């Protein structure tokens, strides 16, 4: 076998000549670029989200949704106003969404 | 360069947006509008 | 015409209802799928106009629609309700449905079993956007709904959560289906034992029946198959000399290479459009399923539903929500009538020339005596002016029997 | 039958669908809504109608004092339905469409 | 502000509602339909790929969905209830 | 041409099948809440 | 309901306390079957 094919006809791996080593071909990192904006009327400040991209390709924050720059990650949670994905919503601050205020009912 | 030019009723180009200048201008080019409302917008794709 | 059947007992059954609420938020690209890394191919694609822009817009719409579906189905509580630290619920056990501190993902044993029951792409220009609500956050919404139901009944759905004793809440839910509150209080231990047994059987039913989670696995597999066929369609030639774009571009001169590239682009765009249209139809089906799930969460979980079979077979008492991958599982706690006995029944009873009809329930006769009892439970009571009303005479009702009505005022 | 075209027969035949409709009719007439909730609890049809009247906010005595008139109206309506469904073209237009 | 209209009588009406539950389960084979009894058109079709196996799957899904629709609409009863031999329904006539 | 025609027919059938499924879902809900039980929702099971 | 000194009967959706009487309460069985009940006086309107 000279090259390896993954399901649906993809060139997953190939054995190299002169070395016989099998090298896995992972497709080069690609992803859409989303723009977080509060609206030009409110502010011209803008944050950038690289979808499904590790924070290794050109404030920064790495999320399951990808690499987001231009927004500061804040621990405390707020109601979502702009959607980013992976449970995170977003100076521009990026936070984990708060599903609701906590209210324990005094059951008796 | 790709430019989004705003024509007026007279036909003079009163304003322009450079799509490659910065992400906000690229978003303005993607939405085909100078003013964008609050929200997420997918404008282009980054690939190495 | 003169015999009725009334159950002398009841069973508290729990039914599992699995509804898919969302699918993988997949998305493709104009060039990375139809063209690849080719400028000439992209220029030829530009002659076709904004076809791929329409396809991308539609896929973005379906992804946002999946996000909206999950938000509508699960985010039905304004504030997160927390279960009381002590589980003094009058004997009722919810450990199987309440989140457990031991599990890091904070998931009930039923919810954890559901995730472990199902088993689980992005290398050809494809992308799978993560869901806005994570597994833990959907589980937290489900836990909040479960706490609200067990602590406030339906009052938390209506507005502010009103603390309610769970046996008393279940007693009023019994009253809601036409069964008097006393029957639950006299049989609270039996109801709690039946409830716990049914909840325990729910885990056995989910873990011992293959394809029980098939309604969710089916949509997951259909999405996976659609992606697999879409990326297998790149291997198709569509009548071109070769499927690969690079070799045909390299080995063919411009005025015939462009014809071959156009033929491949027509085939690939038709494949992408078919996939997008099929995904839109599947998204419409999932949107309808999510609307049904949201309606079931509002009618069965947030309240008590009097429409039969909407929340499971039997008289619906109440229900529990559980998270599931791209889906929700409803545990419907319903009241099913049990061993029943026939009784000689009469529409009205003639006393002193006056026709008496039951204010609630019906008149029954066990052979020698007549009593008034609720329809859903055999609780015979002596015929009195308190539970019967008088209207007209005994000559109008087709079925009339003679019996004495006891008014407490006379003794 | 044409080239490349076939019509798969429905899994449920019309006769079996009619049997299902007959079973539903028998359950509704004999046990009211009880057969839907669970075991079919037999009930006299006037008593079931009286509880349906109670369900729509009319006391059950109203049907019993008017049982003959109510049965006469019901029979007249059912007979009229057959005439209306037979004399009106496109009444089944939804299926024909 | 002080007047109410109350019905002294009633009419029991019957209304017909017609709802389609299923459609003809039509199946079309791509290889026979677009390429009639010829091999060379089938070889040209194979370059197109999975388009019509996808179409056959879609038609199969429609047929299965129609069967499910009819079963869901009609099979709502676990047991087949049988009408009593005597039609003693208190004067209500169900012969129709 | 023939494959495009077959795809169009399949698409039209899929949309019509979705409409028939919606009608069948409504019919099943009517069978449950009007035939199997009594519905308090107005006009779901006829006028009156 | 019990405000802390006396018991009353009220509608669930509005707090309108009323004295426990035989006309707003119905008797079922005895006190040795119902779990978690308290003792109180049911004022019979006919008695005075
Ligand atoms: C009510 O109307 C019916 C006809 O629908 C009639 O036969 C009957 O006598 C009427 N009853 C009264 C009380 O008016
Ligand atoms: C119902 O009507 C039909 C025809 O009008 C008649 O033959 C039948 O006897 C009637 N039913 C009863 C129980 O009399």
Residue numbers in the entry:
A (entry chain A): 563 to 620, 641 to 672, 691 to 708
B (entry chain A): 273 to 320
C (entry chain C): 709 to 828, 853 to 1143
D (entry chain B): 854 to 950
E (entry chain B): 709 to 804
F (entry chain B): 999 to 1046
G (entry chain A): 1096 to 1143
The authors write:
The spike protein of the SARS-CoV-2 binds to human angiotensin-converting enzyme 2 (ACE2) through the receptor-binding domain (RBD) and changes the conformation to fuse the viral and cell membranes, mediating viral entry. Here, we used a structure-guided strategy to engineer an inhibitor peptide with mutation-tolerant and potent binding ability against all SARS-CoV-2 variants. We named the peptide CeSPIACE (COVID-19 eliminative Short-Peptide Inhibiting ACE2 binding). For engineering, we determined approximately 2 Å-resolution crystal structures of CeSPIACE or its intermediate-stage peptides complexed with the RBDs of several strains, including WT, Alpha, Delta, BA.2, BA.5, or XBB.1.5.
We determined the cryo-EM structures of CeSPIACE complexed with spike ectodomain trimers whose RBDs were BA.2 or BA.5-type. The EM map showed that CeSPIACE binds to each RBD of the trimer, forcing three RBDs into an open conformation, although in the prefusion state, the trimer is predominantly in a single RBD open conformation. Two spike trimers formed a head-to-head complex mediated by CeSPIACE involving several docking modes. Another docking complex was observed in the BA.5-type spike, in which two spike trimers docked via seven peptides at three sites. Most particles consisted of the docking complex linked at all three sites, suggesting that triple-linked complexes are more stable than single- or double-linked complexes, which have wobbly sites. The crystal structures and peak retention time in gel filtration indicated that CeSPIACE certainly dimerized in physiologic solutions, but the cryo-EM structures suggested that CeSPIACE has stacking properties that allow it to dock two spikes. The stacking number of CeSPIACE varied, but relatively numerous peptides may render sufficient flexibility to dock two spike trimers distorted by the potent binding with CeSPIACE. Head-to-head complexes similar to the cryo-EM structures would form on the viral envelope, implying that CeSPIACE can bridge separate spikes to aggregate viral particles.
